[PDB]
Write a protein that binds this DNA or RNA. Structure first.
Ligand SMILES: [Zn+2]
Ligand SMILES: [Zn+2]
Ligand SMILES: [Zn+2]
Length: 846
DNA sequence: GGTCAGTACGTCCTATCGATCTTCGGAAGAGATTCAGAG
RNA sequence: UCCGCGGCGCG
DNA sequence: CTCTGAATCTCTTCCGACGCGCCGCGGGACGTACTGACC
């Protein structure tokens, strides 16, 4: 017989075909085939329930639908199911996969015994074999939980968005967890803008040992009180007093220290680590993680369990025993404890085969290889022996002052070998072995000025960590929350940090005022826990949906009323002394979904006296300096003015090339505004921004007779790139290089080397006439290595012949957008290829 | 799983509107604007 | 085999 | 002094003989990699 396996991604289809075989047929059902309506294709209540699809009053009838373009796939799947005998639903582990499987089952038919739900955490031979050995039944409870979540989201969105349109502004949106995330960001922004940085100085001293060794220490006490000078004069006086005094090392301290490795990656930890080390965002991290999982190299990327299988434990222990040695084993496995509410049935994010190094991933892009290296290193480290340091602490007294120094020396690098630190820390230095009660000689000292840091702005990783802490969201939803808070125009991300737009503040204030139950963190956490209980078959989904809908309806009917009755307050106006170009009247500051702008009061007047003239603003972007490190945020807060009526800082906008505007942070609650005059270069540009590889200047998008292209703004540089079908911009095509020594074979012309998105190729010099092209050989490139531009020279370094001695050719991998070298025999590929991974060429069988 | 056939994307190549060839006469119809008559 | 353009010629 | 209708002006579109012969020139095509289906 023939059994049908339905999977979601075509890549998953290929990888699972890599282990199922000829007996089975695998079909890729791209995405969700059945979903609630999206487009438009007591009558108000009927219209609302038709728009939502769900009818909460009538026991939550669903009215699912098949989106356009899915009909062909539905027909193909139905035909294959008629052909097949047993249908296998092999979607992913999470609730989303169960929902997809339930949708497929409902579409195809013949429910009772024709379907088997396959559960595998990694696409590998053993895992697939065990998964297909005893297939499981479709878990209806998890499907119900997913549907409950979707219904809650749709109800809130389609029942709040009209309210926000009526009261605040058209074009708004709302979401149950999206609103809570925006609230977190807005609260952090308010804490930051309320912060008034203090100032404090510090003193560093240089000393030389009687043995001649050097030491650097930091002064920490004065008069047995903490040393924290406020003003420069006090700092100079302290420095003078320190110089006058005599120094002696009155305290010596030593202590062994141990550092244990980190736990294996759960999804939140993986995102944090990717952001901190490789700089990836959450979207890129999860996309590459999904690619790695589908290709079969890593386990499922949506998890909250640090548990590891016995097979994985034995594999990694064997790898450590074979490669590193017994000093790194250690005697017993390293256990890590996850949350009691976590999906302990799942594993962590680990490699599917420890011996596959990151360089060997031929079919994964460079970023994917880096992510896999991170996962592999974490997995190896999690079972290695703790690293050992010895720490030295020195305290030196001089007059009324005391100064301190601390350092550590590493002696065993068991877990730090595979997972090295990004940079050396302040304590990663060598303090000389001074004696107890020793003496020191002095060198010139250095003062320093600092300002107390404000609370750190949310990074994507940090926001995800906060959400994990509060219980808001789940592993399968973090990326959705992060993407949706940005797409909906309430919060932007710049400098790899979260910034709150004013519209976000307005919507957050209104939602807190009217829907206090929905926006509370504890209630959101309780709702998530209730969904989890439903998944565990601890509660009935319709019951909790009804409870939430009852509370939400009460709150909504309360909120829809007039502001005097207690409804949602409108977008109040802050008036300022500016002349309206149409009627010279004073102009207010308003916020729409587009941004923050200047309007005229005439907008509030009837058409007889109405004024629609508006002034568009351009906010000033904060440019944090990466070199300033931790200071980058602090200096930013120091750059802003301060509102006169309150200590809250103010945000800057430009109104004229001569005039700039400052708006209070609590606008429109606080009406403080300021106007400044000066020479201001208006940005005057919008749209794509590219960096010119020829001069490093900004490159902009332009349109002409040939469509759309990209040209550099530098008047001295006319470099132009082009837009292609499925990319932001074409790669930096290099200048063609002629080769008179390579003759054509079908004609009398000579070959010329050209570059492009297709790759690097050889073409006839009379291209419109000869039209003869062939790929270059590595030996051919080595023959004319000198003429090759600086970039392409690496191709000449690639191995010229395979282990079988056959000749190699330069090819372009479009799936990874990179050049490799492959050998061919008798015109067929020998299956040997070498790629360029981090400055070296790695070769292997294809 | 491996192989073959089919399908998809790139190269030639742009980037200022500037290349480019460019400019009738007569009659009819539709739309827009102006003048005269009536109110 | 098709289309197009240009030029020239005859009745 | 104003409004409406009719008349006039402006702009756009359509048509312009038939038949035959000769010469010249031009006109998207080819290559490589990746994915799916069948065996
Ligand atoms: Zn106005
Ligand atoms: Zn203020
Ligand atoms: Zn440039």
């Amino acid at each position: 017989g023939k059994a049908l396996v339905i999977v979601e991604s075509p890549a998953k289809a290929k990888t699972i075909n890599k282990y199922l075989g000829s007996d089975y047929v695998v079909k890729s059902s791209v995405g969700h085939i059945r979903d609630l309506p999206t487009s438009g294709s007591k009558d108000e209540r009927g219209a609302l329930v038709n728009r939502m699809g769900v009818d909460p009053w009538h026991n939550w009838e669903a009215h699912y639908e098949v989106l356009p373009g899915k009909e062909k796939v539905v027909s193909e799947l139905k035909q294959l199911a008629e052909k097949a005998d047993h249908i296998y639903l092999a979607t992913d582990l999470d609730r989303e996969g169960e929902a997809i499987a339930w949708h497929l089952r409902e579409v195809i038919g013949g429910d009772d015994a024709r379907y088997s739900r396959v559960v595998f955490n990694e696409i590998t031979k053993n895992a697939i074999r065990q998964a297909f050995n005893k297939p499981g039944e479709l878990n209806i409870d998890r499907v119900n939980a997913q549907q409950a979540r979707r219904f809650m989201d749709r109800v809130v969105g389609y029942m709040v968005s009209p309210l926000l349109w009526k009261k605040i502004a058209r074009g708004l949106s709302a979401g149950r967890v999206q609103s809570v995330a925006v609230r977190l960001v807005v609260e952090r922004e308010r804490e930051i803008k309320a912060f008034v940085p203090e100032e404090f100085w510090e003193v560093d001293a240089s000393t030389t040992t009687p043995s001649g060794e050097a030491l650097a220490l930091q002064v920490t006490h004065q008069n047995d009180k903490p040393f924290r000078p406020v003003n420069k004069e006090q700092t100079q006086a302290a420095v003078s007093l320190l110089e006058k005094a005599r120094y002696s090392v009155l305290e010596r301290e030593d202590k062994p220290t141990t550092s244990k490795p980190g736990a294996p990656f759960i999804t939140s930890t993986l995102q944090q680590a990717a952001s901190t080390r490789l700089g990836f965002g959450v979207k890129k991290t999860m996309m590459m993680a999904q690619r790695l999982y589908e290709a079969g190299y890593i386990t499922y990327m949506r998890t909250d369990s640090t548990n590891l299988s016995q097979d994985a434990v034995n594999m990694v222990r064997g790898y450590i025993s074979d490669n590193f040695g017994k000093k790194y084993l250690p005697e017993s496995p390293n256990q890590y404890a996850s949350k009691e509410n976590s999906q302990e049935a799942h594993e962590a994010i680990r490699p599917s085969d420890v011996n596959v190094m990151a360089e060997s991933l031929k079919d994964m892009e460079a970023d994917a290889q880096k992510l896999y290296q991170l996962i592999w290193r974490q997995f190896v480290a999690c079972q290695m022996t703790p690293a050992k340091y010895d720490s030295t602490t020195l305290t030196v007294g001089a007059g009324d002052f005391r100064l301190k120094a601390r350092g550590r020396i590493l002696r065993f690098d068991g877990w730090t070998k595979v997972m090295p630190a990004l940079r050396k820390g302040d304590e990663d230095r060598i303090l000389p072995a001074v004696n107890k009660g020793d003496a020191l000689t002095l060198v010139e000292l250095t003062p320093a000025q600092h300002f107390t840091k404000p609370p750190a702005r949310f990074s994507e990783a940090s926001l995800v960590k906060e959400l994990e802490k509060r219980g808001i969201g789940r592993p399968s939803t973090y990326a959705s929350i992060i993407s949706t808070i940005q797409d909906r125009g309430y919060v932007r991300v710049e400098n790899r940090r979260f910034y709150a737009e004013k519209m976000g503040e307005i919507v957050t204030d209104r939602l807190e005022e009217n829907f206090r139950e929905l926006m509370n963190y504890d209630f959101t956490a309780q709702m998530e826990n209730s969904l989890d209980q439903v998944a565990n078959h601890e509660a009935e989904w319709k019951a909790v949906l009804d409870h939430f809908f009852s509370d939400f309806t009460q709150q909504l009917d309360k909120a829809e009323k007039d502001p005097e009755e207690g409804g949602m307050r409108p977008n109040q106006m802050v008036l300022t002394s500016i002349d309206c170009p149409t009627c010279g009247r004073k102009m207010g500051i308003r916020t729409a979904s587009t941004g923050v702008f200047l309007g005229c009061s005439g907008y509030a007047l009837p058409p007889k006296e109405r004024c629609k003239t508006t002034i568009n603003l351009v906010p000033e972007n904060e440019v944090l300096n990466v070199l300033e490190g931790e200071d980058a945020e602090t200096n930013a807060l120091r750059a802003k003015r301060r509102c006169p009526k309150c200590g809250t800082a103010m945000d800057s906008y430009l109104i004229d090339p001569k005039r700039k505007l400052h708006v209070c942070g609590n606008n429109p609650t606080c009406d403080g505004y300021e106007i400044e005059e000066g020479e201001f270069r208006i940005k005057g540009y919008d749209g794509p921004i590219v960096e010119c590889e020829k001069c490093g200047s900004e490159m902009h998008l332009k349109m002409g007779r040939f469509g759309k292209y990209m040209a550099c703004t530098n008047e001295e540089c006319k470099n132009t790139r082009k837009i292609l079908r499925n990319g932001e911009v074409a790669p930096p095509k290099e200048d063609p290089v002629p080769l008179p020594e390579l003759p054509c074979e079908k004609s009398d012309a000579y070959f010329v080397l050209r570059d492009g998105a297709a790759g690097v190729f050889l073409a006839a010099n009379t291209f419109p006439k000869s039209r003869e092209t062939r790929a270059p050989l590595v030996e051919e490139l080595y023959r004319f290595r000198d003429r090759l531009p600086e970039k392409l020279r690496y191709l000449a370094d690639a191995p010229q012949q395979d282990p079988e001695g056959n000749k190699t050719m330069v090819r372009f991998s479009r799936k990874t957008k990179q050049q490799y070298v492959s050998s061919e025999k008798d015109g067929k590929a020998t299956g040997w290829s070498a790629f360029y991974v981090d400055g070296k060429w790695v070769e292997g069988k294809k």
